[PDB]
Subunit: 209 residues, 4 copies
């Protein structure tokens, strides 16, 4: 039904998919915390969220930042019940024209970050015997490797914390052409109490590709 | 979301998952029609459906049976907007000891039925620019073949009727039935318009 | 590896992939029996096979037919060691525009056939503790369903007869030339590898030959 | 077919699968270079390789090492035609008990290494218009992510360099000799148009 009494962290909630997710969760009773890469972005997030949430600044590759953002949340609101990973980026290049910087930046931002954010919130989720982790994954050998890693990670973890009332899934948009409104609907369904027995799943929202 | 003035046909709605699916749909406003193998089972479906629908007998292997029931549905209720295939069966056996009867009966009941019933409700769905087709697929070479076929059928058909406002999906449990209904109700709602050709697994890890 | 002293049944070996497969087994020592829907086709198969095999007419939808040819093979050659199913057809149509027959012919020819032919040769393979079952699967809801079913059948059966020394696989070519995905020869190379003694513990697999698309 | 006139680089060829792969290649005419993390391992690799190859020390996470080893190969033998990645490791732990050190050690060793080594040999493979890249992938959220990434990487790269006469595949074990047979087939001229595939050798699991 509704997310009355649930705290949701939506990384990269500045616009598009991230924002549509955040806006739909709040409408259904959730207290939503959206993040951006800059402080400017965060203020914009705090604006459209109002008092139904707050906008923070987050560097998903920086462990020091991940600790700071969560501590802020645990202090002012409480423990995170829902985690939505949507802070992915791209650095397209053919294999030979792709520098190690571009490869490692994607692995760190799109894959490694999901391991860090999951690990940080897993303690509290197990204690509440409830948890939702959802990752948004839509010359790209680096992006493809990360996208695949996230799926392998989620399915493994999904089995590992299955008993504890925690689910770990992935939503795969099309990126008629797709609508961010419908990706949010997909994420909202998974995050609800009607998707308890859905975990380790990759829900595609592409319209039959 | 609510189903408002939509009609849903659920094959195999006597008990378990099929029932759960049917009960969850009427609870959300749909006019639901459940099916059984026996007339005795059909009334039992009508019993818990009440004024919100009706329970009929349908032999999914029988083309005449598919035609008559659908005619009865159009006559007394209307055109099917939501089709939930859950009429599968099993005839387990090792390949060597499996008869042609035991193989062919599974294919006709689990796979071909989905083709017939899908075709029967497809034309009306595209007239309305809306449709939902959801199939429940849970020594089993005969059951295994049909289960895979349904997925191939659904993915192929989904691609064929996508922009006509129709989605074709499969829910695959690890056979609570109530959780299966929640998944089926999500795909059938207006919240899953852009989800088609998907196999939604409900196993929980 | 070689196939000397082996009997291989290739359904639909008239042309293209079916023929390419058949030819490649023969060249590597196999006694190959190729199949067509018409007698004319069977003679054409016996022609290029020479004395390294024979061409027979088989209707994979007819049980009586399947029994007759397999009886002929056991009589004139022996027990089938390797089965390659490639007698599939297509009756393309939009679902709406698809008559039952067109659906049911594909189910009978592309799916049910594999069950019957597998069932008919399985007894011998278990007694020998060796068997190879390979199926060739490349507005097509009828064709798509059957191909998906074949893979479902293969994976189930592969697990069922694993330790009996029998493998059940599927080779999946991208549509081939009758850049490019592959050609009839390269599908044969794949089918020959799975049928060999070097793919003994490969079973329930779907080997795609599309060349990265 | 035989690999006469081919150079094969097999990372982690000290024992088991790695050695089984290396040993089968030299038997079929290939000049094989197996690597180990330690010199003592390298000498052991040089031993069973005999005059059909050589054993070198390699650190798949260290770029400086990768440049030196390849430079040695081109100096004494030539350009690499076949690349076999089997330098994977494991650091098992539950998510809560997995430290950042344990995670990144796997990502660097099992995934990023494949990216580094593939890029280093891609110039010569396209120049020869022939190439073979084969990767072995057999709480483990870190190993699972790396395994999946390799496949996502391989499928992406395979599509990128397909027409260049190069194939990029993955072998997924569940006897080491049979893992070698699979690797040998893909590296041969009979799998020239098999690329971006994950060949499972498990017996059906």
């Amino acid at each position: 039904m509704s997310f009355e009494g649930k705290i949701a962290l939506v990384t990269g909630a500045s616009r598009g998919i991230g924002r549509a997710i955040a806006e739909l969760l709040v409408e259904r009773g959730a207290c939503v915390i959206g993040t951006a890469t800059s402080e400017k972005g965060a203020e914009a997030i705090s604006a459209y969220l109002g008092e139904n949430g707050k906008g923070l600044m987050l560097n998903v590759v920086d462990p020091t930042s991940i600790d700071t953002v969560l501590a802020t949340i645990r202090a002012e609101f409480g423990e995170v019940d829902i985690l939505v990973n949507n802070a992915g980026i791209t650095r397209d290049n053919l294999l030979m024209r792709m520098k190690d910087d571009e490869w490692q930046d994607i692995i760190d931002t799109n894959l490694t970050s999901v391991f860090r954010l999951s690990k940080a919130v897993m303690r509290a989720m197990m204690k509440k015997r409830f948890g939702r982790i959802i990752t948004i994954g839509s010359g790209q050998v680096n992006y493809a490797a990360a996208k695949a890693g996230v799926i392998g990670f989620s399915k493994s973890l999904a089995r590992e914390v299955a008993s504890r009332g925690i689910t770990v899934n992935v939503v795969a948009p099309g990126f008629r052409l797709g609508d961010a409104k419908e990706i949010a609907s997909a994420v909202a369904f998974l995050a609800s109490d009607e998707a308890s027995y859905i975990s380790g799943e990759t829900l595609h929202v592409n319209g039959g590709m």
